[PDB]
Amino acid sequence: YYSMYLKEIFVDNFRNLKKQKLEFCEGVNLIYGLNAQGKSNLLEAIRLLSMGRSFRGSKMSELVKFDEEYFYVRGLVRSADFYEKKIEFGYKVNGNKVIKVNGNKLKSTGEILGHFLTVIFSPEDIEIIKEGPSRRRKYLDACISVIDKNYFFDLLQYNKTLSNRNSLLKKIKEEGKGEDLLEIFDEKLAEYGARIIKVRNNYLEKLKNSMSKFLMEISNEKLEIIYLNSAGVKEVHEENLIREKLKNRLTKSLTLDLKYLSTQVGPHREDFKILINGYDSRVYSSQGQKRTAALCLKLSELEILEEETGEKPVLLLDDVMSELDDNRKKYILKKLEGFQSFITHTSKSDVEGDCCFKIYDGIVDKLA
Amino acid sequence: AYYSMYLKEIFVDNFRNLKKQKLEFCEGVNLIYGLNAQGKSNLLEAIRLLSMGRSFRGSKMSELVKFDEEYFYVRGLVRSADFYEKKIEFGYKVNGNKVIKVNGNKLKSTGEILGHFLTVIFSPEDIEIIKEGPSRRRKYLDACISVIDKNYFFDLLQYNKTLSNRNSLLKKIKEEGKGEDLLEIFDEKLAEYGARIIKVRNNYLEKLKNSMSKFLMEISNEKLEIIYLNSAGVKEVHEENLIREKLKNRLTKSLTLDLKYLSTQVGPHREDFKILINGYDSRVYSSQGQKRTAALCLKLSELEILEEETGEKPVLLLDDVMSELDDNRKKYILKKLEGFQSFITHTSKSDVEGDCCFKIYDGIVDKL
Numbered sequence A: 001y002y003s004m005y006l007k008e009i010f011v012d013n014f015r016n017l018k019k020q021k022l023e024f025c026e027g028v029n030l031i032y033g034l035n036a037q038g039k040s041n042l043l044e045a046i047r048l049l050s051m052g053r054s055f056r057g058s059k060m061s062e063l064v065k066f067d068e069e070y071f072y073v074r075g076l077v078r079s080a081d082f083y084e085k086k087i088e089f090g091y092k093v094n095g096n097k098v099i100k101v102n103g104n105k106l107k108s109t110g111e112i113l114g115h116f117l118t119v120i121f122s123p124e125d126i127e128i129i130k131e132g133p134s135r136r137r138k139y140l141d142a143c144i145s146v147i148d149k150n151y152f153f154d155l156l157q158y159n160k161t162l163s164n165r166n167s168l169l170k171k172i173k174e175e176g177k178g179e180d181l182l183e184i185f186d187e188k189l190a191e192y193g194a195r196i197i198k199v200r201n202n203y204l205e206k207l208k209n210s211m212s213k214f215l216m217e218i219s220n221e222k223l224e225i226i227y228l229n230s231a232g233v234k235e236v237h238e239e240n241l242i243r244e245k246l247k248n249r250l251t252k253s254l255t256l257d258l259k260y261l262s263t264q265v266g267p268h269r270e271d272f273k274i275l276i277n278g279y280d281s282r283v284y285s286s287q288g289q290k291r292t293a294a295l296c297l298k299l300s301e302l303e304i305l306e307e308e309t310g311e312k313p314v315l316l317l318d319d320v321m322s323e324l325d326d327n328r329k330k331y332i333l334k335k336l337e338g339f340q341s342f343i344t345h346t347s348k349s350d351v352e353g354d355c356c357f358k359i360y361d362g363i364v365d366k367l368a
Numbered sequence B: 001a002y003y004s005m006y007l008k009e010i011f012v013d014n015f016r017n018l019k020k021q022k023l024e025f026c027e028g029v030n031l032i033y034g035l036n037a038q039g040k041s042n043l044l045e046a047i048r049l050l051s052m053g054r055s056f057r058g059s060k061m062s063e064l065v066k067f068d069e070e071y072f073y074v075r076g077l078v079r080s081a082d083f084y085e086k087k088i089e090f091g092y093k094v095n096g097n098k099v100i101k102v103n104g105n106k107l108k109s110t111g112e113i114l115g116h117f118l119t120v121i122f123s124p125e126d127i128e129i130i131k132e133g134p135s136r137r138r139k140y141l142d143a144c145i146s147v148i149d150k151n152y153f154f155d156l157l158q159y160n161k162t163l164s165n166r167n168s169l170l171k172k173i174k175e176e177g178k179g180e181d182l183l184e185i186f187d188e189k190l191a192e193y194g195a196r197i198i199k200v201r202n203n204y205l206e207k208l209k210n211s212m213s214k215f216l217m218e219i220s221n222e223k224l225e226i227i228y229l230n231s232a233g234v235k236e237v238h239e240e241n242l243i244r245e246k247l248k249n250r251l252t253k254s255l256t257l258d259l260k261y262l263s264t265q266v267g268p269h270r271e272d273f274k275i276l277i278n279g280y281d282s283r284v285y286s287s288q289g290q291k292r293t294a295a296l297c298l299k300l301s302e303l304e305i306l307e308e309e310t311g312e313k314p315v316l317l318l319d320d321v322m323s324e325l326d327d328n329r330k331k332y333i334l335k336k337l338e339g340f341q342s343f344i345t346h347t348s349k350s351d352v353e354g355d356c357c358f359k360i361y362d363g364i365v366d367k368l
């Protein structure tokens, strides 16, 4: 076995939170407080060790406590083949992200991906159903990159090239009516986009299969995922084929690209649709049935993460115990066995955690 | 004591999942209840359509049409302070034809429906006003004001019309030459309208500030302040004579920017107002329930202001706002609802048991 595990966390100058070191027990860490406390703030610091950014999309500026110049998070983690691993996040108001794993500072922020695995269940996950393709596309990358460093690299390269190619368009439109030498980037974008498309396709087939079963078991509704990729393909097939399609679309779209100084073809503007019972759930569905869609989305994220990486993530549940009754809660609890849980709530006298913490002014306090 | 706004009956034909029917409601608390995805919000949406001329959810007209149909039609009979029974009729055929009639008479422009039937709608998706972009806020401010202020709503139409006008001149200046002369006037026009909007917007925001504080004070004890980032940088001013120049002013300085982006950059279509809670911008730093509180307050204040500037007393649409309560506020605000017509959606018949209650299933509403 040997599942993941946040042994302890130390946070200095982090958001609301006073400077403190907290030790956690594996299983369910109930955390209760009241809107000026830092429940979500703790959960944030924890995921920061996992992704190296805020799950609430916040600037690393705002993580820094009011009127300070820096903040520091340290965490002690057990992987499956790691008895103990130290992850360190430090930021100063200079603009210096510093990230050490076992004393060894990391080259780029992205290398923090993988060392500590979390799945964060936020009620704001509902936005992946509701917002535009940008929100869904980001989410998609985040799911894959935590599983596949290859995909991550390709993304980064892809964007660099895209950004270069955009500059080159600017100069072409204005300073010289013709560069064919735009050809070299088109070729590069096509070659990278195709690998990106081919991997996204691979993830989404899994999400189809996985979410379908959840969506079916939960509410008897038929799930369907439609990947709106840049190749314009219904089935995905050969990476080579995608490469040739992307390149062509890139040639035929030049004019539009010169009108806008943007690149219209490419995985930087794909999207997937989530059809519940044949209809777009972004356009046609009940609040409650968007909620359910988002829930199965998260379930599948987790299920796939265990499947692909042999590890069992640390589950963070922020403000979900609210929307539930009593037998529906211990039901959920029972599904959380093999996992270390960090669960925020608002009452202690309700859900019985393997150890729990009251939090009042930014100070965590065990067994209360 | 004037007669409250009161919705006697509604007829819906081909409106979302809702069957063809005519329902008759109570002066008082109409409790609409049912399982989810049955049509409670749809129904609430049809109501507010009569009040607002569009979907409160932002959906587009074509999507309101029942699936695989050619039109939809809604009829309301309302009692205002000066009316015993007013007909408001709304129809849309999927050829894009919008048709509104009040008491038989087809209205000239859709906007003219504003003010006849007065509703205030409270949904959980009100949080978004606190924590999305300047779009969401600017727009909700426009909606709030235009309902009370027929005049402003005309100002606004005329602003966006010559704004769009101006931006098409920009695509004929740095693209095709000349255009210099004709440019002079638009700036005067944009500045004339703009300053109307600004004075009025400021008016409402001062009222918003005052009312909201009083609420936010009573409810969570936090201190509210409100900053109106007007387009004329004239923080803390009140005389339209001068704001016209500043806009005419800033509109010249930003000429080359304007030309670079082919958009206009200075005016009230780029404004926003910040909702500070205890000194801190709540877009950025507020908690979650800290926004649930900020939202409810925003709404409460809307209702309050609305009552006192129209001399009416709106219908209250309470969309799925009652799941998340404690019975010490659920049996409370029920008392607060007394003088008004409430539509309250829920999923349980058991005690939110107001003055009347219908049960909806499969788009059909029966009365117990």
Ligand SMILES: Nc1ncnc2c1ncn2[C@@H]1O[C@H](COP(=O)(O)OP(=O)(O)OP(=O)(O)O)[C@@H](O)[C@H]1O
Pocket: A014, A015, A016, A017, A033, A034, A035, A036, A037, A038, A039, A040, A041, A042, A062, A063, A064, A065, A066, A319, B280, B285, B286, B287, B288, B289, B290
């Ligand atoms: N940089 C910061 N410095 C200090 N406090 C901050 C900072 N950013 C956010 N906060 C504060 O954190 C406080 C509450 O923390 P958090 O954001 O975790 O809410 P919460 O206690 O989890 O409550 P809820 O149940 O409402 O989610 C808020 O009052 C907010 O102003």
Ligand SMILES: Nc1ncnc2c1ncn2[C@@H]1O[C@H](COP(=O)(O)OP(=O)(O)OP(=O)(O)O)[C@@H](O)[C@H]1O
Pocket: A279, A284, A285, A286, A287, A288, A289, B015, B016, B017, B018, B034, B035, B036, B037, B038, B039, B040, B041, B042, B043, B063, B064, B065, B066, B067, B320, B345
């Ligand atoms: N144009 C349409 N034609 C047919 N059905 C639609 C249309 N638009 C939305 N629906 C469907 O209406 C059903 C219910 O809509 P609505 O949002 O009113 O559900 P709801 O009753 O609000 O859910 P809840 O019961 O949680 O309030 C959903 O299944 C939705 O997919």
Ligand SMILES: [Mg+2]
Pocket: A039, A040, A318, A319, A344, B288
């Ligand atoms: Mg929270």
Ligand SMILES: [Mg+2]
Pocket: A285, A286, A287, A288, B040, B041, B042
């Ligand atoms: Mg709904």
